[PDB]
Design a protein around this ligand. Structure first.
Ligand code: CLF
Ligand code: CLF
Ligand SMILES: [Mg+2]
Ligand SMILES: [Mg+2]
Lengths: 473, 466, 465
């Protein structure tokens, strides 16, 4: 049934957002409302639309200035917070750019301030030739025309190319609208503005993977072994110009259908490129995804050779962790898709029971997927807030929580360990090896002497201090 | 040609690699140090969530801050109802809540929401709904297109003190000092508490952030809270005097309490290094009539003993760049010269240069330095990287962790100071001010240099009989 | 196949010794006594090199004298050098009260009769200084057995025997005796705070807090041990002895039990959380005093800090540890609490027959999920050679004379034990107790973090841990 938590008695609209799956229900009658307005004052976990454009998608690129048109805080706040390495020295993580909007610019306009800042950025780093300009709350409100500015800068600097995103934080309700605006703008303005050499009979784009701790680079070892050319990664370890070539691919392989389904859908519509949805987290999921890709291309045997070698290399360690993680209870409190990518994969491959899930910004689509794959007795929460997390802990008593670091540091006080479900602990977590990495961190999180020590009150004469025996795969 | 101390602005309009966050972030930091306080940030959701993450990076702890969740409708038609609902949702769900600083953002400053009017609405609504509670709503005007998190911190402290002392007024003299240490770590607060205890001086430290470093307890209780209460803030009207340690981080509240309540304010140099600590203690003795204790003479002497093992051997003539909050940059430059380091480049990150030019510590540096010093105001961290790229030779950087890649790539040892220091463990527990703090800064500098000598094989055999 | 194995060094010679010889440890014991100047009976290097070693660790001078054995004494015996040395000390240092007379390899080989010289000097001193008492303690420390660890223990025991022989049993003091072993001033400061917070009166033997002495306006020299004759004499009258170090003072606790019926309680050296917990439980047991809330809180702050590190940065990382035996075994237990894997433990002297009986071995055997090699009679070449043969380590914990092993192998290294001369201020930083466990864990993490930056090994990950 839908659940009215005690902490939500005075915001009873939250009942429509929390589903406890029970036997024999027709789940179509119990789909959480999702992607609706946030309730003010709740300590919702949601971020802003600008975040979804710059931090999540655009800022992954290795060769692009990220020009944030606004006051300095939006820039400061999106710098030193992500773990998306590159193969060029992590340019994307080292720098952030602001137009340093001041009061004058609010009153009289910021277009000249943006123009000057763009020329300065290109002058300070002459080997960087690509830029994305983002609006933020106040530059949207005052109506600065960033597309016109970008057009002028490109006329004045024939060596550069600039893309613009109109993504103030108050757009939409969450990060999600930033994903949408960036996807649609990119396909409308930049796809089919360049081409690259095709060097394989088999070509694809990999859509919706952001190279967290090197995920994309690990998956690329598969594509290289299979002889498949990736035209563009959207956007993990990617380049601006590769994204201009996306119309050339034969296949679009989608992992993050939430942030990046939009562009896959438009590429299918405009160019006829099929959309294949996979799960690139999960051990047996990864095998299924490789088999689908190889079946599409007619290279089934190459796929079987790869899968056999990866199972021989990694399945024994995975099974060691499954033996020790069987029956452990997990919560997943992340953006949305990892709920449906992980609930059944940790169950199948690790024996782990996901007892509670919360999505910051998922849509009803995401809840359809997670509820289809998820257990009975589990809580499914749209746009969860901090007091709800405490009540859910009291209801389901998780052994481990996959969530962001700040919430991890909160639940530590309750003696509950965490794994960073966003930026990982010791990743990558995609692929065969990556699911072993995920399992290892879950194992070390839960089988942790400090948890046991913390429970002991040394003042209690009846208590001793235990020693715990651990293992390694 | 005599040494010159030169102030100059950043020569670019834009920013690359900002040194500070925006005003609302600093207002949030001020508020999280108050017991039974949840700041409410009136604007889009990122303005809250990114700052809660920033605090988690520095402290490795959660702090509670709420958003009004400005969306499209409210951006176009006004956000008063988002404020008003957010205050009520907080009060309904947090029965012990007492203080809500209502912090504006760029968005809600641009659209001109009437925060004082929303507070009147909310006060009416809260008095009807909760006749047995008193919740203090403080209007905090922090447009992000002026100043920085430094100015936003100062503005929020001042507004919260105005709000609470307006309600309570002046009463029974307390016999206590007010102390505004500025934006410091828990370890700095621990040290100040010890100094006041050893000198038998009663004081309130605003804000008391000691418990930000909270235990993991057998009973699972959460103690990660500010310790400064409504009552403590209200009592500031009754103090003997205010000791303001930070010109840019709370002195304006000391000034307000002097103007409103005749509490005399004493602004001193921020106590980085030996002389500044000595002069702070002399001021405390003057205002209180209490003697400086032998215990502090001894702590001072242990610090000097430790620093004397380092200064002429390892520090003399080494060139340093320092960035961070202005009180910290200027104070660390003075500390550096006590130990024979040469702070040749000081970077201060905001638009307050008209004030910095009048800081008496500039003149103190002009009258002491034997080497040129460039003080860049309105600086970003690209101002540092570009100068190194152009040939500036540095032996040490002192600054916060968002400058780390500058030091890493240039192969320059860096000591992490100020806020945020997320890329090393435990620094929030270390003092940087006072005598113990001077000692621990100097030993961090030496140990950073020593490790660098080993990694680079630069006379690494010399670390034996120093 | 899960095995903790003890083995000896397989070479007769030493390359890169882990410890100094017995007389050096006896000197260290003595310099913690107020109004004490040890007299080292042997050649001059046996004194001067050890005064240098203490200056390397502490960055301070300590006073120790030599008998200056020369060629004539090597032929005819050196008793007259002892006797002269005692009188020259007494005549030139009017406040001197205690002289441990420490033998060396030379004076052990030639068989000088130290006890006979002490009788001569006691008669001379009583005649020449009628209103003074100087305690001469014979300390037999041949360097061709044991190590500075054994020498420390021997000197403490001899000094206590000498002083308590002279004063005997008096009125009950209500205090604990505490022998922390060979620890830093910072460890002593932490223990004093624990006993203060628990409202337990205690003497810490020796009290080395003031080794970290101020540079004072009045130019006063305060770099002295604080343990007095009176403090040592009062050990006879204690409620109980708490011995923290099996190899570094427990034998003095036993002597006081045998002689004065002061019950001795030997506990695991308090490295890490459990060992600290168990120390405090023993204190509570023997005193009847409750463990205070303040120590529950310090414990919780340490656990909170270590929990930010253990599964993220420490789990499955392989560690080698060297140092004094009580420190090595205690740090191995601490390592395990934070998910580190101490695969190689090196203990540097000939006391293997004792180490095989240490109950902490069994505590490791019953807990480790990885093989542990414990090499006794080890030198530091035992570490370097194993690394050269392929042993993969993520961390070394040990004293500064191992530094080049870590530097050349490019392995991060945390400086622990004695001497730690190649970093600043470590003598002031506790390693024992809850705050010490936290400080050690954060040194480990910060050494790893710097290493990640210098080697460009996922250095971008240090943002949102
Ligand atoms: S919801 Fe998002 S992060 Fe917020 S402002 Fe809006 S685009 Fe940006 Fe920016 S400068 Fe500071 S952090 Fe805000 S108050 Fe403005
Ligand atoms: S005066 Fe010189 S240093 Fe002294 S012993 Fe003689 S040659 Fe040597 Fe050696 S082992 Fe220790 S330090 Fe001595 S007691 Fe013997
Ligand atoms: Mg000293
Ligand atoms: Mg903590």
């Amino acid at each position: 049934p839908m659940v009215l938590l005690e902490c939500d008695k005075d915001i009873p609209e939250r009942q429509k957002h929390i589903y406890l799956k029970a036997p024999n229900e027709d789940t179509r009658e119990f789909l959480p409302i999702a992607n609706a307005a946030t309730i003010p004052g709740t300590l919702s976990e949601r971020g802003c639309a600008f975040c979804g454009a710059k931090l999540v998608i655009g800022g992954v690129l290795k060769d692009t200035i990220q020009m944030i048109h606004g006051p300095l805080g939006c820039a400061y706040d999106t710098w030193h917070t992500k773990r998306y390495p590159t193969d060029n020295g992590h340019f994307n993580m080292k720098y952030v750019w602001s137009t340093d909007m001041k009061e004058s610019h609010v009153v009289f306009g910021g277009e000249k301030r943006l123009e000057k800042s763009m020329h300065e950025a290109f002058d300070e780093m002459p080997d960087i030739k690509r830029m994305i300009v983002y609006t933020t709350c106040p530059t949207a409100l005052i109506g600065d025309d960033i597309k016109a500015v970008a057009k002028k800068v490109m006329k004045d600097r024939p060596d550069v190319d600039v893309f613009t995103v109109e993504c103030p934080g108050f757009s939409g309700v969450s990060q999600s609208k930033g994903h949408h605006v960036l996807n649609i703008g990119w396909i409308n303005e930049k796809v089919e503005t360049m081409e690259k050499e095709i060097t394989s009979e088999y070509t694809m784009n990999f859509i919706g993977d952001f190279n967290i701790q090197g995920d994309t680079q690990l998956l690329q070892t598969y594509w290289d072994r299979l002889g498949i050319q990736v035209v563009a990664h959207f956007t993990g370890n990617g380049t601006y110009d590769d994204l201009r070539c996306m119309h050339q691919a034969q296949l679009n392989v989608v992992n993050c259908a939430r942030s990046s389904g939009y562009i896959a859908n438009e590429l299918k519509k405009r160019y006829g490129i099929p959309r294949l949805d996979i799960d690139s987290w999960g051990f047996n999921y990864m095998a299924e995804g490789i088999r689908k890709i190889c079946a599409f291309f007619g290279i089934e045997e190459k796929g079987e050779e790869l899968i056999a070698e990866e199972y021989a290399k990694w399945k024994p360690k995975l099974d060691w962790y499954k033996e020790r993680l069987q029956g452990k209870k997990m919560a997943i409190w992340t953006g949305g898709p990892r709920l449906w990518h992980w609930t059944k994969s940790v169950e199948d491959d690790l024996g782990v029971q996901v007892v509670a899930m919360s999505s910051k910004f998922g849509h009803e689509e995401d809840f359809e997927k997670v509820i289809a794959r998820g257990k009975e007795g589990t809580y499914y929460i749209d746009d969860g807030n901090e007091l709800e997390f405490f009540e859910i802990i009291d209801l389901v008593k998780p052994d481990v929580i996959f969530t962001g670091p700040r919430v991890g540091e909160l639940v530590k006080k309750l003696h509950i360990p965490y794994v960073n479900g966003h930026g990982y602990h010791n990743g990558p977590y995609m692929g065969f090896e990556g699911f072993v990495n995920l399992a290892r961190d879950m194992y070390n999180a839960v089988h942790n002497p400090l948890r046991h020590l913390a429970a002991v009150d040394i003042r209690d004469k009846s208590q001793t201090t235990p020693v715990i025996v651990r293992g390694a795969a | 040609k005599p040494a010159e101390v030169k102030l100059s602005p950043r020569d670019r309009e834009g920013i690359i690699n900002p040194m500070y966050d925006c005003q609302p972030a600093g207002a949030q930091y001020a508020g999280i140090g108050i017991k039974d306080c949840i700041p409410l940030v009136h604007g889009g959701q990122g303005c809250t969530m990114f700052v809660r993450l920033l605090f988690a990076q520095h402290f490795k702890e959660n702090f509670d801050v709420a958003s009004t969740s400005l969306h499209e409708e409210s951006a176009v038609f006004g956000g008063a109802k988002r404020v008003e609902e957010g205050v009520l949702v907080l009060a309904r769900r947090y029965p012990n809540l007492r203080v809500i600083p209502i912090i504006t953002t760029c968005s809600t400053e641009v659209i001109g929401d009437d925060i004082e009017g929303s507070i009147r609405v909310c006060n009416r609504a809260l008095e009807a709904e909760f006749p047995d509670r008193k919740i203090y709503l403080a209007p905090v005007h922090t447009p992000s297109f002026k100043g920085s998190h430094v100015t936003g911190y100062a503005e929020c402290v001042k507004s919260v003190f105005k709000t609470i002392t307006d309600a309570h007024g002046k009463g029974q003299p307390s016999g206590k000092l007010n102390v505004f240490p500025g934006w410091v770590n828990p370890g700095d607060v621990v040290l100040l508490k010890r100094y006041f205890k050893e000198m038998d001086v009663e004081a309130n430290i605003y804000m008391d952030t000691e418990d930000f470093d909270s235990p993991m307890l057998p009973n699972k209780s959460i103690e990660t809270h500010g310790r400064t209460t409504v009552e403590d803030i209200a009592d500031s009207a009754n103090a003997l005097a205010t000791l303001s340690l930070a010109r840019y981080e709370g002195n304006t509240t000391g000034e307000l309490l002097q103007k409103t309540f005749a509490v005399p304010n004493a602004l001193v140099n921020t106590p980085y290094g030996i002389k500044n600590t000595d002069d702070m203690l002399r001021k405390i003795a003057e205002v209180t009539g209490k003697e400086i204790p032998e215990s502090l003479v001894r702590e001072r002497g242990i610090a000097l003993d430790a620093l004397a093992d380092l200064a002429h051997m390892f520090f003399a003539n080494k060139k340093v760049a320092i960035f961070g909050h202005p009180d910290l940059v200027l104070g660390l430059a003075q500390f550096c010269m006590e130990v024979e380091l040469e702070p040749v480049l000081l970077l201060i990150g905001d638009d307050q240069g008209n004030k910095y030019k009048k800081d008496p510590r500039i003149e103190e540096l002009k009258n002491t330095a034997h080497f040129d010093i460039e003080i860049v105001h309105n600086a970003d961290l690209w101002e540092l990287e570009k100068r190194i790229n152009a040939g500036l030779q540095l032996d040490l950087i002192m600054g916060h962790s968002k400058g780390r890649y500058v030091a890493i790539e240039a192969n320059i040892p860096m000591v992490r100071v100020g806020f945020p220091t997320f890329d090393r463990a435990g620094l929030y527990r270390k003092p940087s001010i006072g005598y113990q703090g001077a000692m621990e800064l100097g030993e961090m500098i030496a140990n950073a240099m020593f490790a660098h000598m080993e990694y680079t094989r630069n006379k690494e055999w010399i670390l034996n009989t120093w």
